[PDB]
CSV table of C-alpha atoms in Angstrom, one decimal:
chain,number,residue,atom,x,y,z
A,1,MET,CA,-0.1,-0.1,-0.3
A,2,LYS,CA,1.3,3.6,-0.8
A,3,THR,CA,3.9,4.8,1.9
A,4,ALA,CA,4.9,8.5,3.0
A,5,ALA,CA,8.0,9.8,4.4
A,6,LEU,CA,5.9,12.2,7.4
A,7,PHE,CA,6.7,16.2,9.0
A,8,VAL,CA,5.5,16.9,11.9
A,9,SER,CA,5.5,18.0,15.1
A,10,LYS,CA,5.4,16.2,18.0
A,11,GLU,CA,2.4,17.9,19.1
A,12,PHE,CA,0.3,16.9,16.0
A,13,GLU,CA,2.7,13.2,15.6
A,14,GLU,CA,0.2,11.4,16.5
A,15,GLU,CA,-3.1,12.6,15.1
A,16,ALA,CA,-1.3,12.9,11.8
A,17,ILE,CA,-0.3,10.0,11.6
A,18,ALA,CA,-4.2,8.6,12.2
A,19,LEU,CA,-4.8,11.5,9.2
A,20,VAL,CA,-2.6,10.1,7.2
A,21,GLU,CA,-3.6,6.4,7.8
A,22,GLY,CA,-7.0,7.8,7.0
A,23,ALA,CA,-5.6,8.6,3.2
A,24,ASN,CA,-4.8,4.9,3.1
A,25,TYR,CA,-1.0,5.6,3.3
A,26,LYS,CA,1.7,3.6,5.2
A,27,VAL,CA,3.5,5.7,7.2
A,28,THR,CA,7.1,4.7,6.5
A,29,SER,CA,9.2,6.9,8.3
A,30,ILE,CA,9.1,10.5,10.4
A,31,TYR,CA,10.4,12.9,10.9
A,32,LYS,CA,10.1,16.4,12.8
A,33,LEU,CA,9.3,19.8,11.7
A,34,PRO,CA,12.9,21.6,10.4
A,35,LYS,CA,14.1,23.5,12.7
A,36,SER,CA,14.5,26.5,9.9
A,37,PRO,CA,12.8,25.0,7.2
A,38,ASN,CA,14.2,26.1,3.4
A,39,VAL,CA,13.5,29.0,1.5
A,40,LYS,CA,12.8,26.7,-1.3
A,41,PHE,CA,12.8,23.1,-0.4
A,42,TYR,CA,10.6,24.1,3.8
A,43,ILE,CA,12.6,20.4,4.4
A,44,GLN,CA,16.4,20.2,4.0
A,45,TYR,CA,17.8,19.6,0.6
A,46,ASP,CA,19.8,16.6,1.5
A,47,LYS,CA,16.5,15.1,2.9
A,48,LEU,CA,14.7,15.5,-0.3
A,49,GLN,CA,17.1,13.9,-2.0
A,50,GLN,CA,16.7,10.6,0.4
A,51,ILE,CA,13.1,11.2,-0.7
A,52,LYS,CA,13.5,11.5,-4.3
A,53,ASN,CA,15.8,8.7,-5.3
A,54,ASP,CA,14.1,6.2,-2.6
A,55,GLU,CA,11.9,3.6,-4.3
A,56,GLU,CA,10.1,2.3,-1.3
A,57,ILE,CA,8.6,5.9,-0.5
A,58,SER,CA,5.3,6.9,-2.5
A,59,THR,CA,4.6,9.8,-1.1
A,60,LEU,CA,6.5,13.6,0.7
A,61,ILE,CA,3.6,14.5,3.4
A,62,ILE,CA,4.3,17.5,4.8
A,63,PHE,CA,1.9,18.0,8.1
A,64,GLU,CA,1.7,21.9,8.2
A,65,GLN,CA,0.6,24.6,5.4
A,66,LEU,CA,3.5,24.5,2.4
A,67,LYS,CA,3.7,27.6,0.4
A,68,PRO,CA,3.5,28.7,-3.5
A,69,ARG,CA,7.2,28.9,-4.0
A,70,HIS,CA,7.8,25.1,-1.6
A,71,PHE,CA,5.3,23.1,-3.2
A,72,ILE,CA,7.1,24.6,-7.1
A,73,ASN,CA,10.3,23.7,-5.5
A,74,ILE,CA,9.2,20.5,-4.4
A,75,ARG,CA,7.0,19.2,-7.0
A,76,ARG,CA,10.4,19.4,-9.7
A,77,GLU,CA,12.3,17.9,-7.1
A,78,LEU,CA,10.0,15.0,-6.3
A,79,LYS,CA,9.9,14.2,-10.0
A,80,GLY,CA,6.6,12.4,-9.9
A,81,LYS,CA,6.5,11.9,-6.6
A,82,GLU,CA,3.3,13.4,-5.1
A,83,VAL,CA,3.7,15.9,-2.0
A,84,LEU,CA,0.6,16.4,0.2
A,85,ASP,CA,0.4,19.3,2.8
A,86,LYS,CA,-1.9,19.7,5.7
A,87,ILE,CA,-4.6,21.0,3.1
A,88,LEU,CA,-3.9,18.7,0.7
A,89,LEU,CA,-4.2,15.5,2.7
A,90,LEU,CA,-6.6,15.9,4.6
A,91,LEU,CA,-8.3,16.6,0.7
A,92,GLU,CA,-7.5,13.3,0.0
A,93,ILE,CA,-8.8,11.6,3.4
A,94,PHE,CA,-12.5,13.2,1.9
A,95,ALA,CA,-11.6,12.1,-1.2
A,96,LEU,CA,-11.7,8.5,0.0
A,97,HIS,CA,-14.6,8.4,2.3
A,98,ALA,CA,-17.0,10.3,-0.1
A,99,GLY,CA,-19.0,8.5,-2.5
A,100,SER,CA,-21.7,12.1,-3.5
A,101,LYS,CA,-21.7,14.1,-6.4
A,102,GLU,CA,-21.9,17.3,-3.6
A,103,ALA,CA,-18.9,16.3,-2.5
A,104,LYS,CA,-17.0,15.2,-5.3
A,105,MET,CA,-17.2,18.6,-7.0
A,106,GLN,CA,-16.9,20.7,-3.5
A,107,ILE,CA,-13.2,18.5,-2.9
A,108,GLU,CA,-12.3,19.2,-6.4
A,109,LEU,CA,-13.2,22.7,-6.1
A,110,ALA,CA,-11.3,22.8,-3.0
A,111,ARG,CA,-7.9,21.2,-4.9
A,112,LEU,CA,-8.2,23.8,-7.9
A,113,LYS,CA,-8.6,27.0,-5.5
A,114,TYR,CA,-5.4,25.7,-3.6
A,115,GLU,CA,-3.6,24.6,-6.6
A,116,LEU,CA,-4.8,28.8,-8.3
A,117,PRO,CA,-1.0,30.2,-5.7
A,118,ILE,CA,0.5,28.0,-6.8
A,119,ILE,CA,0.3,28.7,-10.8
A,120,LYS,CA,0.3,32.6,-10.6
A,121,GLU,CA,3.7,31.8,-8.8
A,122,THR,CA,5.4,29.7,-11.6
A,123,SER,CA,-3.6,30.7,-19.6
A,124,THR,CA,-2.9,27.9,-17.2
A,125,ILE,CA,-4.1,30.7,-15.1
A,126,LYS,CA,-7.7,30.5,-17.2
A,127,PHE,CA,-7.8,27.8,-17.6
A,128,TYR,CA,-8.6,26.6,-13.8
A,129,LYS,CA,-10.6,29.5,-13.2
A,130,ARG,CA,-13.1,28.5,-15.6
A,131,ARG,CA,-13.5,25.5,-14.2
A,132,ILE,CA,-13.8,26.7,-10.6
A,133,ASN,CA,-16.6,29.1,-12.0
A,134,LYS,CA,-17.9,26.1,-13.3
A,135,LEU,CA,-18.0,24.0,-10.4
A,136,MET,CA,-19.4,27.1,-8.2
A,137,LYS,CA,-22.5,27.9,-10.5
A,138,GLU,CA,-23.6,23.2,-10.7
A,139,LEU,CA,-22.8,23.7,-6.8
A,140,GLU,CA,-25.0,26.7,-6.2
A,141,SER,CA,-27.5,24.7,-8.9
A,142,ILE,CA,-28.1,22.0,-6.3
A,143,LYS,CA,-28.5,24.1,-3.3
A,144,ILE,CA,-31.9,25.4,-4.9
A,145,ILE,CA,-30.1,-4.1,3.3
A,146,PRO,CA,-30.0,-2.5,6.6
A,147,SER,CA,-27.0,0.5,6.0
A,148,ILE,CA,-24.2,1.3,9.5
A,149,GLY,CA,-22.3,4.1,9.7
A,150,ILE,CA,-19.1,4.6,11.7
A,151,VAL,CA,-18.3,7.9,12.5
A,152,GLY,CA,-16.3,9.0,15.4
A,153,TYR,CA,-13.3,11.2,15.8
A,154,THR,CA,-9.7,10.5,14.3
A,155,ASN,CA,-8.2,8.7,16.5
A,156,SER,CA,-11.3,6.9,18.5
A,157,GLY,CA,-10.1,3.9,16.6
A,158,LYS,CA,-12.9,3.7,13.3
A,159,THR,CA,-10.7,2.0,11.4
A,160,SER,CA,-9.8,-0.7,13.6
A,161,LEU,CA,-13.7,-1.0,15.1
A,162,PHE,CA,-14.2,-1.5,10.6
A,163,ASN,CA,-11.3,-4.0,10.1
A,164,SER,CA,-12.3,-6.0,13.1
A,165,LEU,CA,-15.7,-6.7,11.8
A,166,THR,CA,-15.4,-6.8,8.0
A,167,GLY,CA,-12.1,-9.5,9.3
A,168,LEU,CA,-10.6,-7.1,6.3
A,169,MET,CA,-12.2,0.8,-2.6
A,170,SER,CA,-13.0,4.1,-1.7
A,171,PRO,CA,-15.9,4.9,-0.5
A,172,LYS,CA,-15.5,1.8,2.1
A,173,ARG,CA,-18.6,-0.3,1.9
A,174,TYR,CA,-18.4,-3.6,2.8
A,175,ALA,CA,-21.5,-6.0,3.1
A,176,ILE,CA,-21.5,-8.1,6.5
A,177,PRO,CA,-23.3,-11.6,7.3
A,178,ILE,CA,-24.1,-11.5,11.2
A,179,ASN,CA,-26.5,-14.6,12.2
A,180,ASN,CA,-29.0,-14.6,8.6
A,181,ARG,CA,-28.6,-11.2,8.0
A,182,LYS,CA,-26.5,-9.0,5.9
A,183,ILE,CA,-25.2,-5.1,7.2
A,184,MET,CA,-23.8,-3.3,4.6
A,185,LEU,CA,-21.0,-1.0,7.2
A,186,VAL,CA,-20.4,2.2,6.3
A,187,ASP,CA,-16.6,3.9,6.3
A,188,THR,CA,-17.7,7.5,7.4
A,189,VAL,CA,-15.8,10.3,7.3
A,190,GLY,CA,-13.8,11.2,10.9
A,191,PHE,CA,-14.7,14.6,12.6
A,192,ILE,CA,-11.7,16.2,12.0
A,193,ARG,CA,-10.2,18.6,15.0
A,194,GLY,CA,-9.0,21.9,13.1
A,195,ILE,CA,-10.1,21.7,10.0
A,196,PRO,CA,-8.9,24.4,7.6
A,197,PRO,CA,-11.1,27.1,6.5
A,198,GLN,CA,-10.3,26.6,3.1
A,199,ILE,CA,-11.6,22.7,2.6
A,200,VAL,CA,-14.5,23.2,5.7
A,201,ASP,CA,-17.1,23.0,2.9
A,202,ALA,CA,-15.6,19.8,1.5
A,203,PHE,CA,-15.6,18.9,5.0
A,204,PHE,CA,-19.3,19.2,6.0
A,205,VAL,CA,-20.7,17.7,2.3
A,206,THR,CA,-18.4,15.2,2.6
A,207,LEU,CA,-19.0,14.5,6.9
A,208,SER,CA,-23.0,15.0,5.8
A,209,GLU,CA,-23.2,11.7,3.9
A,210,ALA,CA,-23.3,10.1,7.1
A,211,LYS,CA,-27.1,11.0,6.6
A,212,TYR,CA,-27.8,7.9,4.0
A,213,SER,CA,-27.3,5.5,6.6
A,214,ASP,CA,-29.9,3.6,9.0
A,215,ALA,CA,-27.8,3.7,11.6
A,216,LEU,CA,-24.5,4.8,13.4
A,217,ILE,CA,-22.1,3.9,16.0
A,218,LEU,CA,-20.4,6.4,17.5
A,219,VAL,CA,-16.9,5.4,18.3
A,220,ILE,CA,-15.5,7.3,22.0
A,221,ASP,CA,-12.2,7.2,22.8
A,222,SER,CA,-12.1,5.8,26.5
A,223,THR,CA,-8.6,7.0,27.7
A,224,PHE,CA,-10.1,10.3,27.6
A,225,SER,CA,-10.4,12.3,31.3
A,226,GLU,CA,-13.8,12.7,32.2
A,227,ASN,CA,-13.8,16.3,30.6
A,228,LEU,CA,-12.3,15.5,27.4
A,229,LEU,CA,-14.7,12.4,27.4
A,230,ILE,CA,-17.9,14.8,28.2
A,231,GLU,CA,-16.8,17.3,25.1
A,232,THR,CA,-16.1,15.2,22.5
A,233,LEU,CA,-19.5,13.5,23.4
A,234,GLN,CA,-20.9,17.1,23.1
A,235,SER,CA,-19.4,18.2,19.7
A,236,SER,CA,-19.7,14.8,18.5
A,237,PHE,CA,-23.6,15.4,18.8
A,238,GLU,CA,-23.8,18.9,17.9
A,239,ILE,CA,-22.0,18.4,14.7
A,240,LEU,CA,-24.6,15.4,14.6
A,241,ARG,CA,-27.4,17.9,15.0
A,242,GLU,CA,-25.8,20.8,12.6
A,243,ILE,CA,-25.4,18.4,9.9
A,244,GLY,CA,-28.7,17.3,9.9
A,245,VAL,CA,-28.3,13.7,11.5
A,246,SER,CA,-32.3,13.3,13.0
A,247,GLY,CA,-34.3,10.4,14.1
A,248,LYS,CA,-31.5,7.6,13.2
A,249,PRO,CA,-30.6,4.5,16.2
A,250,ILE,CA,-27.3,5.8,17.2
A,251,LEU,CA,-25.1,2.5,18.8
A,252,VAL,CA,-22.1,4.4,21.0
A,253,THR,CA,-19.4,2.5,21.5
A,254,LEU,CA,-16.9,2.9,23.8
A,255,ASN,CA,-13.8,2.3,22.8
A,256,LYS,CA,-10.1,1.1,23.6
A,257,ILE,CA,-11.2,0.3,27.4
A,258,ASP,CA,-7.6,-2.2,27.4
A,259,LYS,CA,-5.9,1.6,27.6
A,260,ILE,CA,-8.2,3.2,30.6
A,261,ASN,CA,-6.2,1.6,33.1
A,262,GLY,CA,-8.9,3.0,36.0
A,263,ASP,CA,-12.5,3.1,36.3
A,264,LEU,CA,-14.2,1.9,33.5
A,265,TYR,CA,-17.7,1.3,34.9
A,266,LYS,CA,-17.9,4.9,36.0
A,267,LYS,CA,-16.8,6.3,32.5
A,268,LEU,CA,-19.2,3.7,30.8
A,269,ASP,CA,-22.1,5.7,32.7
A,270,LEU,CA,-21.3,8.9,32.5
A,271,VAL,CA,-21.3,8.3,29.0
A,272,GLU,CA,-24.6,6.9,28.5
A,273,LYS,CA,-26.1,9.4,30.9
A,274,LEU,CA,-24.8,12.7,28.7
A,275,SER,CA,-25.5,10.6,25.2
A,276,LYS,CA,-28.8,10.1,25.9
A,277,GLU,CA,-29.2,14.0,27.4
A,278,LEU,CA,-27.8,14.8,24.0
A,279,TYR,CA,-29.5,12.4,21.8
A,280,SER,CA,-32.3,10.7,21.0
A,281,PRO,CA,-33.0,7.3,20.3
A,282,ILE,CA,-29.6,6.3,21.3
A,283,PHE,CA,-29.4,2.2,20.7
A,284,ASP,CA,-27.2,1.5,23.4
A,285,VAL,CA,-23.5,2.0,25.0
A,286,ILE,CA,-21.1,-0.4,25.0
A,287,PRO,CA,-17.6,-0.9,25.9
A,288,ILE,CA,-15.4,-2.7,23.9
A,289,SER,CA,-11.5,-3.0,22.8
A,290,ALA,CA,-11.4,-3.5,19.0
A,291,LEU,CA,-7.3,-3.8,19.2
A,292,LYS,CA,-8.0,-6.4,22.0
A,293,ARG,CA,-10.6,-7.8,20.9
A,294,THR,CA,-13.3,-7.4,23.8
A,295,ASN,CA,-16.4,-7.7,23.7
A,296,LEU,CA,-16.9,-8.0,20.1
A,297,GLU,CA,-19.4,-10.9,20.6
A,298,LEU,CA,-21.3,-8.0,22.6
A,299,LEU,CA,-20.7,-5.5,19.2
A,300,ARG,CA,-21.7,-8.3,16.9
A,301,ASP,CA,-24.8,-9.0,18.8
A,302,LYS,CA,-26.2,-5.7,19.3
A,303,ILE,CA,-25.4,-5.0,15.5
A,304,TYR,CA,-27.7,-7.5,15.1
A,305,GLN,CA,-30.3,-6.9,17.4
A,306,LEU,CA,-29.8,-3.3,16.0
A,307,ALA,CA,-30.2,-4.8,11.9
A,308,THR,CA,-32.9,-6.9,13.4
A,309,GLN,CA,-34.9,-3.5,14.8
A,310,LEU,CA,-34.5,-1.6,11.6
A,311,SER,CA,-35.6,-4.3,9.4
């Protein structure tokens, strides 16, 4: 699968890793951001030469926003190989999770707009503007078996939960048998922290596809402190309300419970009380560990029972 070299601060590293893997890349090396960025290449020239020539690295990913002159100079050196900055990386995540025409158009619109400052730093300008104006036109004119979508913040364990259920394309939709029922599991885009303003519409439109699913599984990191757990739940439900999720059963899975080292039953009871205060109908609230495979038979049985309720 595609291999990336990732440059990222330690502060963002864990989050960036989980973003790069949501864009279908394996992170094969990781470096801090440069202390004093190179004026032409951002990263150091010798590192750039190594990545240019390394057949096991398909892609350079820089978790920052690059200036145009950096794109121009990096893309030349890489001769073919792709560079993504933080904007282009999140637009890649969206492209891999979007199945609707409107989201595909917003993603392509955002990519085109991002390329304009690069071209201007390099006829081609007018060509891009005509495509951007056509998409904006059409967007404005759009304006006027059970499927279970998995939602939740980045790094809550959504891919691990999907993979666990499926035993494992884009968008990711995969049917599984449970007892005598066939259920469509759907990899919805995560709630992303810190979305750059340029891509907020592409994000929301892609995420709004979650309303196509008959029910949702909301995945919550149990290792979070009580106050952070509360905040994560309050934002998760605030986002779902605002994108127009209404009346869908939601199964909340409190995940990574192997890593708590703490009071699981108090977390679970907090989550369950707050979730039902914030939303109806909550199908249920269960603790699991998708990595350690704890309570996976419960998670299976609850998905079957939801699938039966829906049918």
